[PDB]
Design a protein around this ligand. Structure first.
Ligand SMILES: [Mg+2]
Ligand SMILES: [Zn+2]
Lengths: 66, 54, 251, 288, 1316
DNA sequence: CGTCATGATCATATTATTACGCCAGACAGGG
DNA sequence: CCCTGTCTGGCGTCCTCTCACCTATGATCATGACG
């Protein structure tokens, strides 16, 4: 289901900006989980370009230079 | 503070008369099983000096 | 925070940290001068419960309070839920160069333009007017330009008509439901104090004119003007993204 | 209420009729309040489960898509083929029933001219490429999505479709609500699906299956009526036959589950000991 | 006959039903409840005496001392209401209490006290209520709102369906005390019976039945019948009553008297029961399998062994029968445990019980209350006697005892406030009866189960909580001190009592700030039945059913006036005729329809007495005697409407206005509006604003005079008489002699309230509406208030409206208004803003208010005087200086940027000790001079009335016609006159005169003391300067106007005069609405209001034509009489033949701007009457005039509807919502802009807008929308330099609030970082 | 000159429950 | 150990506007007045 499918992600910032933050941060704390900003909402959090519109061309350039 | 009354009096219902005591030292439903040792050890303490908060 | 009454109604965090430091200093002094055998235990229980009040208040049994019934705020109450850093400060922010007023009709508009007051257009577009003043040479410094546009002399309205001209703004109705709820127009200066908004466009906002209020935003940078012209203009979004039905149905 | 409001707003309404109108009106207002309260949270959960899905390639390179047929509740056809297979890239290339003659190639966006050419030839089921059966790792390719809705052409490489999808589903959540036989209408050939049928003594066709679905194939290939047929129902017709309109072709009992047979012979009792397995209950006022 | 202000402008009245009970005083809930609260009340209850006699006498901890109670008394307040609102104090009265201390001796508490002491003591300050029904808490006029909550008593609810997911319903029986511990009996799906106390842990219910000292034999004696088995020579025979066998299938062949009655395999029919009870069959024969599962009742003991044969409440087996049979017992008592009739719920409950006697039950109850501690028999007895059985901790009220006896079918409605054994046993009996299938459950929303608290009862409860805290202090200082040396004011202190009552009146969830911008808004905020607050439900949790109108709101709570939004149906408003019962329920009037005739006696029915009887509907036709003219009449029996016969009715409604409230009974043609639009119309009629010159409603309901007079905005005459001096400030009435006291000679002075600030920043004015020399009657208006006119209620103004689409400028709901409206200054409302400036006390020294100010020149300081404070009258702009203030740094008060105004009033308050500057001494001399002149004029005016009394007495009995005015006037007593009533009266007037002399001396000294003294103020403030700006806001495109039916709208274009559609007479229409709002939003009442308003103005135009031509009074009398008859059988029936040729000219002077027409709510003017009144004027019959165009000058096809609609300006203006921000201040903890308008803030770019920009491809717009424009401080300073240099470019950076997220997550044990 | 009384200023955390509701997943009760 | 009930954790629209409220009580020390 969509609330369990959104809480079960490989990215703890999305699952923290959604429902319960305590359980998500403790599970990602003891697991040592490592987000890589992976899409839209983590980049809205951290203050950079969305990888959707014009920022999609910017992210293809940034990933090609990796 | 140390008190000694639990035979057939008010075990836990009337702390004192009034004043304003925090509680009955909590630590479980009833007070921690106080044996006959610490009481005798606290019969003549404060064998140091003024110490204080400097 | 001061409340301007000689006293500080403190935040809840300083109360919590103050309780932990009181209880910890009393526990250091009680471990100093020796604990009465089975005694150095109640104080550590109190310290553990004060830290559990600080890290997440209310998760352990009955929470604490300062005044009077409401439980006060720990750290986990600053990260979680609404009124916390994820949903109130980081995903949706308060934004400079913005304003809001009450909407109205004005049917003499083309559908890519909206009426917007002279006072709102003068207060949103201030640094543009400062730049045009010290680029045309009508004020030496920034302070003379600020006092000119505070007095509203007879030349700054020409400056304002020369900065509005090809510069979109974003109009926004307050319950944004779908993506047509934010659109971009080219302003027209209006004597008055309301936002004249094209009628056909109000099919997409679900907006009547019985007291609705809309908010205008300004795109500062150059790429944002191009995105509010090529992607978000009111002439481009004539089809809904839910189907192929037109959204410019005459009401 | 069994005594209705026999007065309109041009005339008056007396006190009780206006009070009953107030029952209805305040029920509606409280519905709208708590309705908005649920609808906003539905939009939130959908844009937070989608949130990430960006059109990130241009061709995945698979074939398996879903099968688009017009929906048939059992009356008029509710949603036709033109309004479902509008603008979505075909999975397997559609061959007209002049078999080994291709009508559309297998990567053609079906815009309005192609949909009219589908409606003319009465195409059965245009198997079409869906987003759920894609192959792109970490995203969704462009051809499996379809037309860029709100525009005309194919979807651009990049437009975040999870967010527009979740808003398009949750946005009409304000408008939503919160709190014997088979009768035919049209005329055509008769189709049966998943049926185990046998011949009775009367000459009809009786059924030994719950999973029977009756269909009405029309003159050009598609289906305009579908009926779930119960277990042990009795048909007045058979498969592949021809009927007329207004003709009830099936009948059963919704109260009784029939235990009808296949072979013709005597009936005996096996592992049926009286007093324990079967009891003696005489029907008193009837006799049988 | 008519009162003299009803001969000014007599309102035309349609309406058919002759009234029998007039509208009561609309503020009777507040005033009657608080009069019930504070009054010297003997016989104990109710009031403050209930608290003072339930918490006192405080007796000590066995120290033989006792602080008992005598009486109480409230002194006068030190400040009257006006000084209290000006200065800012509470409007309180000191509560003096006479307490007594007695101190008993040793060995005899039944012996003599050695010493008593009775004395006066000070405790608390309870705030009084003003005559308007409001409180003044800190200078702001507040209202405490009535609460609707659950009635104390038993309540048998049924948890239907949802539990256990198998359809098996539960049944719980909540006993709701008024004060104490709750008690919930319930079931479970195993059909056991479970008690619980205050939602705590769950126990089996019979554990409390042992706690009331019942043995188990007595419990089964109570809760079951008995079945008798007699062992008489053959198979252990049975006593059988066949009523238990109604439908049971026997296991054998029941025969008796040598006759087969019942066969095996069949059941016992009812006729077989008749056979067995007709033949009187007693003993039948049972097999050995019949008592295989019968449950024994009581204990049987064997006499030989002394052991127990079988325990109580045990099924019987073969060996138990073999044991008790050979022990000598012939009688066996068992129980009847049927499937339908009587389940063994008590028996299964006793089988789950581990307890066995009273002591173990009390131990288990003491253990479920306080967990994990050693019980003792004394502690368990004390706890269980202090849960339910003590006068202290448990108290049903009289309401509670009434519901508890009524819902258990008792007789006496009087009982004790505590429970007993019979009470709990009757609760369990009724719960088992409801489970058995007979009897019904009780719904919640039924208004026989919803009590209404008010101001008096809630203030009593908060005062009682203050008293139990102070008895928790006195039980302290009483047995821990030396006696006798102290007095009972050293013990009891006034801090918890005053803190409790001041916290309740100060900040509660029901003591709320009065919405005061309208007389209607006052009088409908005071009448509010809120469901929220303490003891009730909450908005964001519940629910569905409580937000719905129950069938018994009819005539108690209004169905259509409620706020839409998050709390519909919780903020209910009480109806018009709805009183409050003796206990607290709602009651409403009816007319006792005896067998044929509707008797005109009123008769108040409650909510449960209404259900049993049958009530006729309000508008049923009856022919002059009371005989119902139909033979089927629409009625309602038990919450359900139907059609009944002519003379089975028992009550009729009083008047047809009683379902609605006073908010939604000023709507004309209410029966034509759909209920949603009537709701929105009533709510916006509450939200109006007072205009400059309020006019009148042409189409009213006649309910305007009740709302105007029965509120407190007009100056109602107390004693009638003759006016002597009218002024814009004061009004002097000379009291008539047939209304007048013998002493205290008496001519009344009404000091009107001129321009002052309301709570919603409107302008609460009072204008005198009487002439000079004019007679006034008792109970009559003298001075109109805000939004009143001649004693009526004029909220908005009535304007010429046309329904036509006009070139798109009224597209959705918009309104298009001619410039003729704004030229006439007719919506030009007057607002008043209060701007405060305090002189605080900081370091480097105090502040300066003087005008020697740095950084300023002549152009600022020209509008200030020589001491900083702006003048009174200086018309300022937005951003000048009002008060100049410099700290040890300019911090002068300024007009906030945007508002103009004219400074009308300046207050200066000085903390005592501080040097008064020259302007504070100017205000002190000014107010000394004003109060000096005012009290001297009090003495002069009352002395003039006294000398007029002396002249009136000396007309007879030793009259001196010439000698009276030769001597000075103060000696009119020693003239020639004997010892009569006249020299006695002159001596009494000399007593009054010398009293006025010495009273004037002492009161002028006290008033100089009040002006000269300082005022107690904030900690560390020198002086407070308050300045009142008086803005005059006219009208503009963007304001919100609305009619009285829900037709809202933002006025969209203020056209010129010429563009308006005019008709073939010449007059332009004022407002052009939109027709398309009528068929969807079904408010068809506004079109009937429009047509009847055009009829009213047609009659007004014909009066203006017959009067402008200077015609004699005969033709005016003719036409006014024809316009006042005009209808069916109506109520008005006026005649102008008793107005005498001078009032008719003045009545026509008041009718020339239109003729007011009353239209009551559900008994209004029908269509044919509107047509006949439009035929009296020469208007067209259909109401539609053909209208020309203003632009083209050519005719609109298909003639359009014009008329007059009464439209209201709402105070959602557009220069209070409009806001704009380039770059202002920034918040401190997260570097984002501030929120709001007063704080110069920016609009919240919320979360759904972020989703809507992700939904496009706009990426740079969102990046600057949440990094550059909002948060990143170096990013936004780089942005500001780049914008003023022409380079549109952003240097992004990081949001600083994300660094705040890192510090808050990092301040835990969590280590968040940023890699690479 | 000394003692007593009154007034003013400064100093810390119960004072001596009841009217939401659903879902869900773990913890444990019964068998 | 295999259900099956209980328990306690989560969650419950957006944007804006207005208003109030944010101790008082007790104890100790100092000063003044009276004996
Ligand atoms: Mg609207
Ligand atoms: Zn694909």
């Amino acid at each position: 289901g969509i609330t369990k499918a959104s809480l079960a992600t490989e990215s703890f910032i999305s699952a923290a900006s959604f429902q319960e933050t305590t359980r998500v941060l403790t599970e990602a704390a003891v697991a040592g989980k490592r987000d890589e900003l992976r899409g839209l909402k983590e980049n809205v959090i951290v203050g950079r370009l969305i990888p959707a519109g014009t920022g999609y061309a910017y992210h293809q350039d940034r990933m090609r230079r990796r | 503070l140390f008190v000694e009354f639990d035979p057939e009096v008010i075990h836990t219902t009337t702390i004192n008369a009034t004043r304003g005591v925090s509680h009955f030292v909590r630590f479980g439903a009833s007070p921690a099983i106080v044996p006959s040792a610490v009481i005798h050890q606290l019969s003549v303490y404060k064998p140091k000096d003024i110490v204080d908060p400097a | 925070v001061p409340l301007d009454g000689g006293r500080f109604a403190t935040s809840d965090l300083n109360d919590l940290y103050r309780r932990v430091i009181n209880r910890n200093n009393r526990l250091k002094r009680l471990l100093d001068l020796a604990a009465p055998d089975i005694i150095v235990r109640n104080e550590k229980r109190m310290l553990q419960e004060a830290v559990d009040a600080l890290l997440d208040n209310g998760r352990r049994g009955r929470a604490i309070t300062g005044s009077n019934k409401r439980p006060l705020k720990s750290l986990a109450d600053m990260i979680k839920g609404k009124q916390g850093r994820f949903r109130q400060n980081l995903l949706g922010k308060r934004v400079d160069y913005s304003g809001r007023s009450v909407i109205t009709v004005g049917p003499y508009l083309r559908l890519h333009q909206c009426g917007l007051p002279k006072k709102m257009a003068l207060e949103l577009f201030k640094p543009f007017i400062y730049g045009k003043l010290e680029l045309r040479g009508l004020a030496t410094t920034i302070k003379a330009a600020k006092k000119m546009v505070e007095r509203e002399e007879a030349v700054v309205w020409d400056i304002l008509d020369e900065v509005i001209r090809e510069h979109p703004v974003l109009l926004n109705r307050a319950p944004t439901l779908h993506r047509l709820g934010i659109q971009a127009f080219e302003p027209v200066l209006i004597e008055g104090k309301a936002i004249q908004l094209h009628p056909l466009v109000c099919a997409a906002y679900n907006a009547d004119f019985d007291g609705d209020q809309m908010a205008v935003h300004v795109p500062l940078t150059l790429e944002a003007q191009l995105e509010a012209r090529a992607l978000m203009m009111s002439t481009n979004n004539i089809l809904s993204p839910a189907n192929g039905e037109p959204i410019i149905v005459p009401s | 209420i069994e005594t209705p409001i026999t007065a309109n707003f041009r005339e008056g309404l007396n006190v009780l009729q206006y009070f009953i109108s107030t029952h209805g009106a305040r029920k509606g207002l409280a519905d709208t309040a708590l309705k908005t309260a649920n609808s906003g949270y539905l939009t939130r959960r959908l844009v937070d489960v989608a949130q990430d899905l960006v059109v990130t390639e241009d061709d995945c390179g698979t074939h398996e898509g879903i099968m688009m047929t017009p929906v048939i509740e059992g009356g008029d056809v509710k949603e036709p083929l033109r309004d479902r297979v509008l603008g979505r890239v075909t999975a397997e290339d559609v061959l007209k029933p002049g078999t080994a003659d291709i009508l559309v190639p297998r990567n053609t966006l079906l815009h309005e001219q192609w949909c009219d050419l589908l409606e003319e030839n009465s195409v059965d089921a245009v198997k079409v490429r869906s987003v759920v059966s894609c192959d792109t790792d970490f995203g969704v390719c462009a051809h499996c999505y379809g037309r860029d809705l709100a525009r005309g052409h194919i979807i651009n490489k990049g437009e975040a479709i999870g967010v527009i999808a979740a808003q398009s589903i949750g946005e009409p959540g304000t408008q939503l609500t919160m709190r014997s036989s088979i009768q035919v209408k049209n005329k055509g050939s008769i189709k049966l699906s998943n049926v185990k049928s046998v011949v009775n003594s009367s000459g009809k066709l009786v059924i030994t299956s719950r999973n029977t679905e009756l269909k009405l194939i029309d003159e050009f290939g598609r289906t305009k009526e579908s009926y779930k047929v119960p277990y042990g129902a009795v048909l007045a017709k058979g498969d592949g036959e021809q009927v007329a309109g207004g003709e009830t072709v099936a009948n059963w009992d919704p109260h009784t589950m029939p235990v009808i047979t296949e072979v013709s012979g005597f009936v005996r009792f096996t592992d049926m000991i009286d007093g324990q397995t079967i009891t003696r209950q005489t029907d008193e006022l009837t006799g049988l | 006959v008519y009162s003299y202000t009803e001969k000014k402008r007599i309102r035309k009245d349609f309406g058919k039903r002759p009234q029998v009970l007039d509208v009561p005083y609309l503020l009777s809930i507040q005033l009657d409840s608080f009069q019930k609260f504070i009054e010297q009340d003997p016989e104990g209850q109710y009031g403050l005496e209930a608290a003072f006699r339930s918490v006192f006498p405080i007796q000590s901890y066995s120290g033989n001392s006792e602080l008992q109670y005598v009486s109480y008394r409230l002194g006068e307040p030190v400040f009257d209401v006006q000084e209290c609102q000006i200065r800012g104090v509470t409007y309180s009265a000191p509560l003096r209490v006479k307490l007594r201390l007695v101190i008993y001796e040793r060995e005899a508490p039944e012996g003599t006290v050695k010493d008593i002491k009775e004395q006066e003591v000070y405790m608390g300050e309870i705030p009084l209520m003003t005559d308007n029904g409001t409180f003044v808490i800190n200078g702001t006029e507040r209202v405490i709102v009535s609460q609707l909550h659950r009635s104390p008593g038993v309540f048998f609810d049924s948890d239907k369906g949802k539990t256990h997911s198998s359809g098996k319903v539960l049944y719980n029986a909540r006993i709701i005390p008024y004060r104490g511990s709750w008690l919930d009996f319930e079931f479970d799906p195993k059909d056991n019976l479970f008690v619980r106390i205050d939602r705590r842990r769950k126990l089996p219910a019979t554990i409390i039945l042992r706690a009331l000292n019942y043995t188990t034999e007595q419990i089964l004696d109570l809760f079951f019948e008995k079945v008798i088995f007699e062992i008489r020579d053959n198979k252990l025979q049975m006593e059988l009553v066949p009523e238990r066998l109604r439908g049971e299938t026997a296991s054998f062949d029941i025969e008796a008297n040598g006759k087969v009655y019942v066969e095996k395999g069949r059941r016992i029919t009812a006729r077989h029961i008749r056979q067995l009870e007709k033949d009187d069959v007693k003993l039948i024969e049972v097999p050995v399998e019949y008592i295989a599962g019968k449950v024994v009742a009581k204990d049987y003991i064997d006499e030989s062994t002394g052991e127990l044969i079988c325990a109580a409440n045990m099924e019987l087996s073969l060996d138990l029968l073999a044991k008790l049979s050979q022990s000598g017992h012939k009688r066996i008592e068992t129980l009847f445990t049927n499937d339908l009739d009587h389940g063994p719920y008590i028996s299964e409950t006793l089988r789950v019980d581990p307890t066995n006697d009273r002591l173990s039950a009390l131990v288990e109850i003491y253990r479920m209350m306080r967990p994990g501690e050693p019980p003792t028999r004394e502690a368990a007895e004390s706890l269980f006697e202090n849960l339910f059985f003590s006068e202290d901790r448990y108290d049903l009220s009289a309401v509670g005892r009434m519901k508890f006896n009524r819902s258990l079918l008792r007789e006496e409605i009087e009982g004790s406030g505590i429970l007993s054994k019979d009470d709990i046993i009757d609760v369990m009996k009724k719960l088992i009866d409801i489970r058995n299938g007979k009897g019904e459950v009780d719904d919640i929303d039924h208004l026989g189960n919803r009590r209404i608290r008010s101001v008096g009862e809630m203030a009593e409860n908060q005062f009682r909580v203050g008293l139990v805290r102070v008895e928790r202090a006195v039980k302290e200082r009483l047995s821990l001190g030396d006696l006798d040396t102290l007095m009972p004011q050293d013990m009891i202190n006034a801090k918890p009592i005053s803190a409790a009552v001041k916290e309740f009146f100060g900040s509660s969830q029901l003591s709320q700030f009065m919405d005061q911008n309208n007389p209607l808004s006052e009088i409908t905020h005071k009448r509010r039945i809120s469901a929220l607050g303490p003891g009730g439900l909450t908005r964001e949790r519940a629910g569905f059913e409580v937000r719905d109108v129950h069938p018994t709101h009819y005539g108690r709570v209004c169905p259509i006036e409620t706020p839409e939004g998050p709390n519909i149906g919780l903020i209910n408003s009480l109806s018009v005729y709805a009183q409050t019962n003796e206990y607290g329920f709602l009651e409403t009037p009816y007319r006792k329809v005896t067998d044929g005739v509707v008797t005109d006696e009123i008769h108040y029915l409650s909510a449960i007495e209404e259900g049993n009887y049958v009530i006729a509907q309000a508008n049923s036709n009856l022919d002059e005697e009371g005989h119902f003219v139909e033979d089927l009449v629409t009625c309602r029996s038990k919450g359900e409407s139907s059609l009944f016969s002519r003379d089975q009715v028992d009550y009729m409604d009083v008047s047809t206005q009683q379902v609605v409230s006073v908010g939604a009974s000023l709507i004309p043609f209410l029966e034509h509006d759909d209920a949603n639009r009537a709701l929105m119309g009533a709510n916006m009629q509450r939200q109006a604003v007072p205009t400059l010159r309020a006019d009148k409603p042409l189409v009213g309901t006649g309910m305007e005079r009740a709302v105007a007079v029965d509120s407190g905005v007009t100056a109602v005459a107390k004693r009638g008489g003759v006016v002597q001096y009218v002024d814009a400030s004061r009004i002097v009435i000379k009291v008539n002699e047939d209304e007048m006291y013998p002493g205290e000679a008496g001519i009344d002075i009404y000091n009107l309230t001129k321009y002052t600030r309301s709570n919603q920043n409107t302008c609460i004015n009072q204008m005198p509406c009487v002439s000079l020399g004019e007679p006034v009657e008792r109970g009559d208006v003298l001075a109109d208030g805000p939004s009143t006119d001649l004693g009526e209620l004029a909220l908005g103004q009535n304007m010429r409206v046309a329904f036509m689409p006009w070139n798109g400028y009224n597209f959705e709901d918009s309104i298009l208004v001619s410039e003729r409206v704004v030229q006439e200054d007719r919506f030009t409302t007057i607002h008043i803003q209060e701007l405060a400036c305090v002189s605080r006390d900081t370091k480097l020294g105090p502040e300066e208010i003087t005008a020697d100010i740095p950084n300023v020149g002549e152009a600022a300081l020209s509008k200030l005087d020589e001491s900083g404070i702006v003048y009174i009258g200086a018309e300022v702009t937005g951003g000048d200086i009002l008060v100049g203030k410099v700290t040890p740094k300019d911090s002068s008060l300024r007009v906030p940027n945007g508002v103009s105004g004219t400074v009308i009033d300046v207050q200066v308050f000085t903390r005592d000790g501080v040097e008064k500057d020259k302007r504070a001494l100017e205000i002190e001399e000014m107010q000394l001079k004003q109060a000096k002149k005012d009290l001297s004029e009090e003495l002069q005016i009352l002395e003039a009335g006294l000398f007029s009394r002396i002249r009136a007495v000396l007309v007879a009995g030793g009259v001196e016609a010439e000698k009276l005015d030769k001597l000075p006037r103060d000696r009119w007593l020693e003239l020639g006159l004997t010892d009569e009533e006249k020299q006695n009266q002159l001596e009494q007037l000399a007593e009054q005169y010398d009293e006025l002399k010495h009273e004037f001396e002492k009161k002028l000294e006290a008033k100089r003391r009040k002006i000269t003294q300082g005022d107690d103020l904030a900690p560390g403030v020198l002086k407070i300067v308050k300045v009142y700006l008086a803005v005059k806001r006219r009208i503009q495109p963007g304001d919100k106007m609305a009619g009285r039916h829900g037709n809202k709208g933002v006025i969209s274009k203020i056209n010129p005069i010429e563009d308006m559609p005019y008709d073939e007479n010449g007059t332009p229409v004022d407002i052009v609405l939109n027709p398309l709002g009528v068929p969807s939003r079904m408010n068809i009442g506004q079109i009937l209001e429009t047509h009847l308003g055009m009829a009213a103005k047609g009659i007004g135009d014909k009066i203006n034509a017959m009067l402008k031509q200077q015609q004699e009074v005969a033709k005016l009398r003719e036409f006014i009489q024809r316009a006042y008859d005009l209808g069916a059988d109506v109520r008005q029936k006026v005649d102008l033949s008793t107005f005498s040729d001078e009032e008719v000219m003045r009545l026509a002077e008041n009718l020339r701007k239109g003729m007011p027409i009353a239209t009551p709510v559900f008994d209004g003017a029908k269509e044919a009457e509107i047509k006949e009144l439009l035929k009296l004027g020469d208007l067209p019959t259909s109401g539609q005039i053909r209208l020309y165009d203003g632009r083209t000058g050519e005719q609109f096809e298909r003639p359009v509807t014009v008329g007059y609609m009464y439209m209201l300006k709402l105070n959602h203006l557009v220069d209070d919502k409009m806001h704009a921000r380039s770059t202002g201040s920034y918040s401190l903890v997260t570097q984002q802009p501030l929120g709001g308008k007063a704080q110069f803030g920016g609009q919240r770019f919320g979360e759904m807008e972020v989703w809507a920009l992700e939904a496009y491809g706009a990426a740079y717009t969102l990046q600057e929308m949440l990094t550059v424009k909002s948060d990143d401080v170096n990013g936004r300073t780089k942005m500001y330099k780049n914008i003023v240099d022409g380079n549109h470019q952003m240097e992004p950076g990081m949001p600083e609030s994300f660094n705040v997220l890192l510090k808050e997550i990092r301040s835990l044990g969590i280590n968040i970082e940023l890699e690479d």
